[PDB]
Design a protein around this ligand. Structure first.
Ligand SMILES: Cc1cccc(C)c1N(CC(=O)Nc1ccc(-c2ncon2)cc1)C(=O)C1CCS(=O)(=O)CC1
Ligand SMILES: [Zn+2]
Lengths: 348, 128, 617
DNA sequence: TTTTTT
């Protein structure tokens, strides 16, 4: 019953091929490419150990049944949107998912269609079929007809919903970091893990999440295949570099979601404490006009000066994903700013 | 104070006027002014040639002496170089600018209202 | 990597405020009904218009140009429902560039397009009817009625055009929120209630109410799910309140004297109006950015903080800015400061300087060349207009005397070196002037590009063989910084354009691809007529201080006219460049008599002195 | 003095 969320892409147009696998039509269907995936089953170390078990180092998952909700980049603000859910429980189907989540081998249409959970797959499009019927008036059949008879509208409408789901491989290596760590882990979190797990990271931007990934310094091992990150050309090479990445099937894949939460908690403990001190004094200083600008530009230096910030980010950088074996240590942002500026501004 | 100590550590030291002038053998300001007075009068000829010849024989008398500003007059009533109103007094002003380099500014204080009554107005600033 | 940190962790309180501001349901009676907008259409004059309230929220994200207020719009876009807009096409494209550099942003248009502004509205009498506000204290209803009477000739036309969807999808599901998709080409205001207006200080106060008004329109005719949920618009206005201003132009049709007065921008309207600062609760809804990533020099940084916040001008500041003053005849001389943009405080001054620059670049041997530009006036339209102006005696050249600054779609037209127009009646009284253009100069479309072609030698390769004899090439068969290359050639005025070969000017983009653009045709329609065919390119070498507010510059030399010295103009001119090293000026704005208007400055200062205002570095 | 919206 292990549930997977999979961000897919195709070397061709995605919405075209996708709708063409929701009608069981052997006209247009292209290899699905799963480079991003989150697996879950219905404390912090209990969560780490549960995930490290599912994201088996061997490869693929550990559960015997899998419900994969294949998703595209769109808005249901959600960053991805479910397209077709598929239940692989049969031995062969579980075997092909494992070598597509662990090596990056394209999941052929016939396996996408054989496992199609039509009951819940068309439930996502049930409202879409109704609205298209009503609009054009002025189950699988619902779409087979709407597309065969009214293709442009369905394509453009499945293009308005599921917005910008057709981006190219350079787009991914540009917005999801040039590094392999980013390309795997940040794509997993920002798209398929942020909103589901909730927490503060649901409201953080892509650049912020990439910065958090940059400070997630889990021991890097020289890529075995020496595959260049820049060499990646098609969604075939992005997916390969990602699925066989050391950051995708084990401890790092299990520690990243917890580390996002930890880093934010430590940072806000300091940012919020110091914003309270800046807000008490901004409101109760009664100081000179030039001296007010001097104070506020001094307050924010003491709180966010590049050296102080560098020390703080080096104090939250990890060297291991296990929360009970983490190398992160207490940050000296707040304590020092209060012991070097705030008590002396409390000399009011 | 905390602003000044923190600015000295992030941006750099801006050397005082006296130290910068010491590089050009000035321990004597009214003599350095004389040597660059030629550059000053050359820029006057190039951009203000209609009043250039009033600046052929000029004596430099100190006006303001600070640790960041040195204003020095040029009595030989000279003419305003901005408008065409015997209405202005000329003042050479030396400060440290850019990468600790000496900026020599010709400034004129006129009396006519078009020019703020007896207020310093700069006209050109060159290096030394 | 640490540069983003403060923004990353300080935008979250902003995000955790806009959400409740957008998810606050109104009482049933307070929702503007459809019948309201039906009655507005019936009303002819904006006098019997009823005092009604159109509810709205604001969240002001203010700060200097270099503050990070635009990074906040990045975090908002990827987390919240929003319709990102811009006060100018340049600002909209700048936001698109900075939003697509992180994730996907849908094509960002202007707020004017969003509320339905069309061609005929461009030249519309937007200041005609009067209003004696039954006010002090000014009720919000009175302020909204003033802003609707101000824009009666636009609000009325928009309402009439909209009046004279989602209900079908509501009948089935009794789906609706999927109308933005299944039913396409629908206005973007029907799918969100958070409207981000960037550089909103470039919009006048009349627009604020207008936008809210229009919002309710487009959510009433279509009966949007937000209208059923009783949500209200929230206007996230992002802009610099002390580096941007809005101006209103009125043309008197007998004196032919086009006048431009200053106006209250949306930011100033919201900050400085006691009625709006209470209804919108600006204290709990402010986001003042306090950073200048475009200023690392400590000294230039101090001066820019002195001018943004209105702090006393001291002797030290005078001595610092003293190191920039270079003579009047040094800036204006084209031989000096090559590649430095020169700002003047008059369009005539720019028209003089550009002509002088062309003279220099021709006598000392870029290449200057006059390019054909024509003005197609209509005989009947002018005769009817002369009849209606109470003065039927007016020469066509006198028609083109001061209506030129108005017949154009871009202001830069009044600051170009051109030849004289012509009395060339066709019977359409066409006219013909000749603008001079420096080839290989900075050229900025104020058009449809058609790309024709693309270790130091240029690998010149094009789809067709080109021969640039002189300047015209021999091809046989707005934000983007283009490069002028040459003029290859390759309905009543359409026939004449077929007659006289219209030259298509060729531009070179940043990559180097030769993109051939088209021509601009613009109408004049104001009354109490003429379509102008020209090229619409700007040199980016000389401009006005007022237009400089829009875009940042690399190297700047400022020409200040004494007496007209406004410290806001000085601050705007001096803040367009990142580094104080590359900045030269006519005189010292701090040492000369300057009319300082420090009223909004103290308002920001009191905002920086309020516990509920979020100051993000 | 003073731009800008299609
Ligand atoms: C604030 C700060 C934090 C961390 C690191 C630095 C470098 C700084 N800065 C840069 C800065 O303030 N830049 C800036 C300049 C002008 C404007 C502006 N305001 C209106 O229009 N533009 C806005 C921001 C300083 O200057 C310090 C230096 C040490 S200190 O003196 O202790 C405090 C100020
Ligand atoms: Zn004078």
């Amino acid at each position: 019953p292990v549930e997977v969320t999979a961000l897919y892409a195709t070397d061709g147009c995605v919405i075209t091929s996708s709708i063409a696998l929701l009608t069981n039509s052997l006209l247009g269907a292209e290899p699905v490419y799963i480079f991003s995936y989150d697996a879950y089953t219905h404390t912090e170390q209990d969560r780490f150990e549960e995930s490290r078990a599912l994201y088996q180092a061997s490869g693929g998952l550990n559960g015997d049944s899998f419900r994969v909700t294949f998703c595209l980049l769109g808005t249901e603000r959600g960053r991805t949107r479910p397209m077709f859910v598929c239940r692989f429980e049969r031995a062969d189907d579980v075997a092909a998912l494992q070598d597509a989540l662990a090596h990056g081998t394209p999941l052929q249409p016939d396996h996408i269609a054989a496992t199609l959970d039509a009951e819940a797959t068309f439930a996502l499009h049930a409202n879409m079929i109704l609205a298209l019927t009503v609009a054009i008036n002025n189950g699988q059949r619902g779409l087979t007809t709407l597309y065969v008879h009214h293709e442009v509208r369905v394509l453009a409408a499945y293009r308005r919903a599921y917005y910008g789901s057709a981006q190219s491989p350079f787009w991914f290596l540009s917005k999801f970091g040039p590094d392999e760590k980013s390309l795997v882990l940040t794509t997993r979190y920002y798209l398929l893990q942020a909103q589901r797990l909730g927490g503060a990271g649901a409201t953080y931007d892509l650049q912020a999440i990439k910065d958090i990934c940059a400070t997630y310094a889990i021991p890097h091992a020289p890529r075995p295949d020496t595959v260049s990150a820049a060499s990646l050309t098609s969604f075939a090479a992005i997916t390969r570099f990602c699925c066989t990445s050391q950051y995708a099937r084990g401890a790092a894949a299990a520690g990243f979601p917890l580390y996002v939460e930890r880093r934010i908690a430590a940072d806000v403990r300091e940012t919020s404490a110091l914003e309270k001190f800046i807000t008490h004094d901004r409101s109760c200083l009664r100081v000179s006009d030039r001296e007010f600008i001097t104070y506020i530009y001094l307050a924010h230096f003491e709180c966010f000066s590049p050296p102080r910030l560098a020390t703080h980010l080096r104090a939250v950088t990890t060297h291991d994903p296990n929360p009970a074996a983490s190398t992160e240590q207490p940050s000296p942002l707040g304590r020092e700013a209060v012991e070097q500026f705030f008590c002396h501004v409390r000399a009011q | 104070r905390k602003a000044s100590r923190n600015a000295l550590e992030h941006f750099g030291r801006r050397e005082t006027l006296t130290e910068v002038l010491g590089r050009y053998n000035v321990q004597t300001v009214e003599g350095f002014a004389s040597e660059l007075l030629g550059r000053i009068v050359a820029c006057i000829e190039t951009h203000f040639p209609e009043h250039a010849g009033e600046y052929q024989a000029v004596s430099v008398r100190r006006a303001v002496s600070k640790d960041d500003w040195v204003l020095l007059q040029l009595v030989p009533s000279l003419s305003c170089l901005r408008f065409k109103h015997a209405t202005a007094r000329t003042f050479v002003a030396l400060s440290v600018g850019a990468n600790n380099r000496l900026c020599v500014s010709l400034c004129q204080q006129c009396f006519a209202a078009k020019c703020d009554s007896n207020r310093l107005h700069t006209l050109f600033t060159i290096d030394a | 990597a640490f540069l983003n940190f403060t923004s990353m962790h300080g935008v979250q309180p902003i995000l955790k405020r806009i959400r409740e501001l957008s998810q606050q349901q109104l009482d049933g009676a307070q929702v503007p009904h459809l019948q309201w907008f039906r009655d507005v259409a019936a009303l002819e004059s904006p006098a019997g218009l009823p005092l009604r309230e159109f509810p709205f929220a604001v969240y002001l994200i203010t700060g200097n140009a270099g503050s990070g207020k635009s990074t906040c719009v990045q975090t908002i876009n990827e987390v919240l429902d929003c319709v990102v807009t811009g006060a100018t096409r340049i600002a909209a494209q700048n936001m698109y560039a900075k939003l697509s550099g992180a994730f996907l942003s849908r094509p960002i248009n202007t707020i004017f397009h969003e509320f339905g502004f069309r061609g005929n509205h461009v030249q519309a009498q937007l200041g005609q009817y009067p209003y004696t506000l039954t006010s002090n204290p000014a009720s919000l209803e009175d302020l909204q009625r003033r802003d609707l009477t101000y824009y009666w000739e636009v609000i009325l036309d928009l309402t009439k055009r909209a009046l004279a969807e989602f209900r079908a999808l509501a009948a089935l599901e009794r789906l609706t929120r999927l109308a933005p998709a299944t039913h396409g080409a629908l206005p973007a205001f029907t799918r969100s209630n958070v409207i981000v207006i960037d550089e909103a200080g470039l919009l006048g106060r009349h627009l604020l109410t207008a936008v809210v008004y229009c919002w309710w329109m487009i959510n009433a005719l279509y009966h949007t799910p937000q209208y059923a949920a009783r949500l209200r618009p929230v206007l996230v206005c992002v802009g610099s309140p002390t580096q941007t201003a809005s101006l209103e132009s009125t043309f008197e049709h007998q004196k032919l004297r086009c006048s431009v007065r200053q106006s209250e921008n949306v930011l100033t309207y919201l900050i400085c109006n006691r009625t709006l600062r209470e209804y919108a609760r600006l204290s709990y809804s402010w986001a003042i950015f306090i950073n200048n990533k475009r200023c690392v020099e400590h000294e230039f940084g101090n001066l820019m903080k002195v001018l943004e916040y209105g702090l006393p001008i001291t002797e030290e500041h005078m001595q610092f800015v003293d190191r920039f003053v270079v003579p009047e005849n040094y800036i204006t001389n084209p031989a000096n400061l090559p590649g430095w943009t020169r700002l003047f405080s008059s369009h005539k001054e720019v028209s003089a300087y550009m002509a002088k620059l062309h003279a220099y670049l021709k006598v000392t041997r870029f290449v200057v060349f006059t390019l054909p530009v024509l003005t197609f006036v209509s005989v009947k339209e002018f005769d009817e207009y002369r009849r209606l102006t109470h003065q039927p005696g007016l020469t066509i050249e006198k028609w083109l005397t001061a209506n030129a600054s108005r017949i154009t779609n871009y202001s830069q037209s009044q600051d170009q070196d051109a030849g004289h127009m012509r009395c060339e009646v066709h019977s359409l009284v066409v006219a013909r002037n000749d603008v001079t253009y420096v080839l290989n100069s900075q050229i900025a479309v104020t058009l449809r590009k058609l790309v024709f072609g693309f270790e130091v030698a240029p690998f010149s390769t094009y789809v067709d063989n080109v021969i640039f004899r002189g300047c015209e090439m021999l091809t046989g068969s707005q934000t983007d910084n283009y490069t002028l290359m040459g003029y290859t050639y390759a309905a009543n005025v359409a026939e004449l354009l077929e007659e006289a070969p219209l030259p298509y000017v060729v531009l070179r983009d940043q990559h180097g691809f030769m993109s051939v653009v088209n021509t601009n045709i613009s109408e004049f329609v104001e009354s109490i007529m003429a379509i102008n065919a020209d090229y619409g390119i700007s040199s980016k070498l000389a401009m006005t201080i007022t237009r400089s507010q829009g875009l940042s510059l690399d190297k700047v030399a400022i020409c200040f006219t004494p007496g007209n010295l406004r410290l806001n103009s000085a601050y705007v001119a001096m803040s367009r460049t990142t580094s104080s090293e590359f900045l030269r000026m006519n005189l010292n704005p701090l040492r000369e008599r300057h009319e300082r208007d420090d009223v909004i400055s103290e308002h920001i200062l009191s905002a920086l002195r309020d516990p509920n205002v979020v100051i993000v570095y």
